[PDB]
Each structure stands twice: as structure tokens, then as C-alpha cells.
């Protein structure tokens, strides 16, 4: 990730304010609502038949929190995203066969959620750094396809 020391500091400072439960549930639920094909991977999660049901689904919220926790691991290991995400790359690529384009979509949904939560504090500069982050995470997750 082409992140400078000063950009890195700003990225970690924002994550310090991120509630992984609320932000995670919301980002995963938005993925499922905005890009409904992603629901194919979540049949076991129960009711996903409308936006209210998806957003209010306990399994969506619980799982989104776990996803965001792993994003946080990435944020705190920017110089080794490949290693950080190696196990999850095997899961998502080799076991689940998720198209890697969707890793980029989820990263961008997370960015939109951060924008919603942080408002004007989520500056164009800070968003730019987060774009580098979510691109790095998506690339690391897709390693098993490379």
C-alpha cells in the first residue's frame, strides 16, 4: 500500500473511533442490499428478503462485526496485508469461490459507511488513504487467485 507515514497515522487514528459492531453490521447489510447477488453466499443466515430484514438480521450484524475486526487487523498490519489475510484468502477463494470483484465492492461499501458515520471528519484526504487500504485488503484477499 502506497501509504506514507503521515497517511498511516491518520488511518489508524480513524480506526480508533470505529465501532466494529455497528459499522460492521451496517457494511455487510448494505453489501447484501445494494449488491443482492452477494446473498448467494449467505443462505444459512435466514431472512434476507428485504432491506429491513437484512439490516435487522442478527446473523448479518454478528458476521459484519467479525469482518470489520479483520479489516482492523489489516489497518494495523499495512506492511503485511498478504500474511494478515492469507488464511482468509484460502477461505474466500479456495473454499467459497467468491469472485474477487466483490472484495472491492465490500471495501467500497465500508468506505461509504465510514463516510456516513464520520461526516465531515471523513475528509477527501482521509478517504483517499482508506481507498488505498481497502484496495490492499481486496488484493491480499484475492492472493489465492493470483
Amino acid at each position: 500500500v502506497q501509504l506514507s507515514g503521515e497517511e498511516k497515522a491518520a488511518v489508524l487514528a480513524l480506526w480508533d473511533k470505529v465501532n466494529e459492531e455497528e459499522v460492521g453490521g451496517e457494511a455487510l447489510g448494505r453489501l447484501l442490499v445494494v449488491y443482492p447477488w452477494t446473498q448467494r453466499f449467505f443462505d444459512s443466515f435466514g431472512d434476507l428478503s428485504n432491506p429491513g430484514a437484512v439490516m435487522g438480521n442478527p446473523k448479518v450484524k454478528a458476521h459484519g462485526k467479525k469482518v470489520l475486526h479483520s479489516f482492523g487487523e489489516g489497518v494495523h498490519h499495512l506492511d503485511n496485508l498478504k500474511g494478515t489475510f492469507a488464511a482468509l484468502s484460502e477461505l474466500h477463494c479456495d473454499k467459497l469461490h467468491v469472485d474477487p470483484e466483490n472484495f472491492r465492492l465490500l471495501g467500497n461499501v465500508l468506505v461509504v459507511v465510514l463516510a456516513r458515520h464520520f461526516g465531515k471528519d471523513f475528509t477527501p484526504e482521509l478517504q483517499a488513504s482508506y481507498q488505498k487500504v481497502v484496495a490492499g485488503v481486496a488484493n491480499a484477499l484475492a492472493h489465492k487467485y493470483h
Binding site: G29, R30, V33, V34, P51, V54, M55, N108, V111, V112, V113, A115, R116, H117, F118, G119, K120, F122, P124, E125, Q127, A128, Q131
Partner: protein, 141 residues
Amino acid sequence: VLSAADKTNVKAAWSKVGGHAGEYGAEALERMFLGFPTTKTYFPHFDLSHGSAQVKAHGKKVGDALTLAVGHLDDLPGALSNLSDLHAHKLRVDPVNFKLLSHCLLSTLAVHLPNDFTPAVHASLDKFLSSVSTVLTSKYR
């Protein structure tokens, strides 16, 4: 063409934009230039710095075109025909860049309208921006 429900969501959300469409267009452009620097090369003779007169002006144009699109959801091809000629024939804008600007527009709307930017409205605006992007890339020979 969007569903009736999507059109309703899009017109509703755009009403909440109030008179801020131009401001939001400018900010979306800034977010795009910083988040996706490849896009800067389309504007070689612009001052792309924050608060730039040129970026402010250009954001007003983008916001005005989106406002026009919101008013013409039943005929985006007709409403945006000329702008599609410009973006494809003349400017040769890579279709990827429409996805980038659309993402930056959603980001900007989320910043400023957090209570209105619900999951269903996010979905409808995404479809709206996809439809606009499709028309804007439709003129490729």
C-alpha cells in the same frame, strides 16, 4: 430504466440535497481526484487543489446534470444524449471512471445526509448512478 420504487427513492433523496447539488458535485470530484489519481489527467488545465474556482464551477455543472437526470428518469438517453457524445466521442472517458465518480458521489451524499442515506436509498441511488453512467458511455463507436 429504474423501477417505480427506485425513481421514488431517487427523487426523494435528491429533494434532501436541497440547494447543495453543486457543492456535492465539487466535493465528489475532489474525492475522486485524491482517491483515484489517474482521473486527474482528464483535467490537465484545471487547478485541482481544494476550494479551487474551477473545481467549484465544474461540480456545479455535474450537480446540474444530475438534477436534470433526476427530473428525466423515464428518458435518460434523451436527456443525456449530448453529454454522452461529449464524454465518449470527444473525451474518451474510460467507463471505469464513471464507477469511480459514482462511488465518490455516494460517499459525498453519505457525508452530508447520514440520516437520509439509508440502505434502500443507497441501493436506489447506486442504480440511478449506474443508469446515468450507462448512458454516458453509450456513445462509443
